[PDB]
Write a protein that binds this DNA or RNA. Structure first.
Ligand SMILES: [Mg+2]
Ligand SMILES: [Mg+2]
Ligand SMILES: [Mg+2]
Ligand SMILES: [Mg+2]
Ligand SMILES: [Mg+2]
Ligand SMILES: [Mg+2]
Ligand SMILES: [Mg+2]
Ligand SMILES: [Mg+2]
Ligand SMILES: [Mg+2]
Ligand SMILES: [Mg+2]
Ligand SMILES: [Mg+2]
Ligand SMILES: [Mg+2]
Length: 231
RNA sequence: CGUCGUCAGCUCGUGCCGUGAGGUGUUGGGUUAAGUCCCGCAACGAGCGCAACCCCCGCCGUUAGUUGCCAGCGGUUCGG
């Protein structure tokens, strides 16, 4: 499922803004830039996917996290397809570590979904209409992919582990295994199942996350063909 | 009951940080009479206060017309 001209898409980046634990996954340093050994990226995509596979055919949830502008939209796409939860926007603190309390805020999300599905009163004072709606958009704005999550995931997939160290931390505290794509600005040992590739190119984020979803649906019940990529 | 003080404040739940007292939230940019609301944030909510809900005066309408009122008619001892 794997493809080999990811060279055509990503082969990493970043200058000496590195982390030296990532040494093992590195070929050489060219444009004043850390260049990732693709043959290692390979050994790993495999091992990661083997983990990814076993998780779909047992029907286990995956939490998708990425909020840097690059991976922002493409997680709303690729995760919706597998219908699995995500946070695209802001990563609220304690989403895993304080799940039951965070979630007590989705019942509020649902409660507005009902209360706005009419009527249950519109003789509620005018501003109160306007007020509650604003709240609705707000919840929707962060929680739109989170609600799908009704229990702690059996695993989580992250786009930037550094950028989302909080996430990685919360998972790790819970024993929730962490899969992530990650370039040289990151700490390897911190990831269980790892994709050493560029994490800032919309090209790259695209290849890696898509084939993930494609591998999810394929061993889940079905197969599908192409899904949206911004040119 | 006074008072600080009608001052915008004081907490809590769970999460997180710290060996610990404790921190965070409640800080931060803007805005407000105000922890008033906005945005941002390892926090997310909740409580008591703020506010609002009550009384008063200011505008109008309705329901009422005596012991209250008198615009027009009629008288009128000259006092609706
Ligand atoms: Mg990066
Ligand atoms: Mg606490
Ligand atoms: Mg200390
Ligand atoms: Mg502790
Ligand atoms: Mg405390
Ligand atoms: Mg305070
Ligand atoms: Mg404090
Ligand atoms: Mg301030
Ligand atoms: Mg005041
Ligand atoms: Mg308040
Ligand atoms: Mg705040
Ligand atoms: Mg009051």
């Amino acid at each position: 499922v794997k493809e080999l001209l990811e060279a055509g898409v990503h082969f990493g980046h970043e200058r000496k803004r590195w982390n030296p634990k990532f040494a093992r996954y590195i070929y050489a340093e060219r444009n004043g830039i850390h260049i990732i050994d693709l043959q290692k990226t390979m050994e790993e995509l495999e091992r990661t996917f083997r983990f990814i596979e076993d998780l779909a055919m047992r029907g286990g949830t995956i939490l998708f996290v990425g909020t840097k502008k690059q991976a922002q939209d493409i997680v709303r796409m690729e995760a919706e397809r597998a219908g699995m939860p995500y946070v695209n926007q802001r990563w609220l603190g304690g989403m895993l570590t304080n799940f039951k309390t965070i979630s007590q805020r989705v019942h509020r999300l649902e409660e507005l979904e009902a209360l706005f599905a009419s009527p249950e009163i519109e003789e509620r004072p005018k501003k109160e209409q306007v007020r509650l709606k604003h709240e609705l958009e707000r919840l929707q704005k962060y929680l739109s992919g989170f609600r799908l999550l009704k229990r702690l995931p059996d695993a989580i997939f992250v786009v930037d582990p550094t950028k989302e160290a909080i996430a990685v931390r919360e998972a790790r505290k819970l024993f929730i295994p962490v899969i992530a794509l990650a370039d040289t600005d990151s700490d390897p040992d911190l990831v269980d199942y790892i994709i050493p590739g560029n994490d800032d190119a919309i090209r790259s984020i695209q290849l890696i996350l898509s084939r993930a979803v494609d591998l999810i649906i394929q061993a889940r019940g079905g197969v599908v063909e192409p899904s949206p990529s911004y040119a």
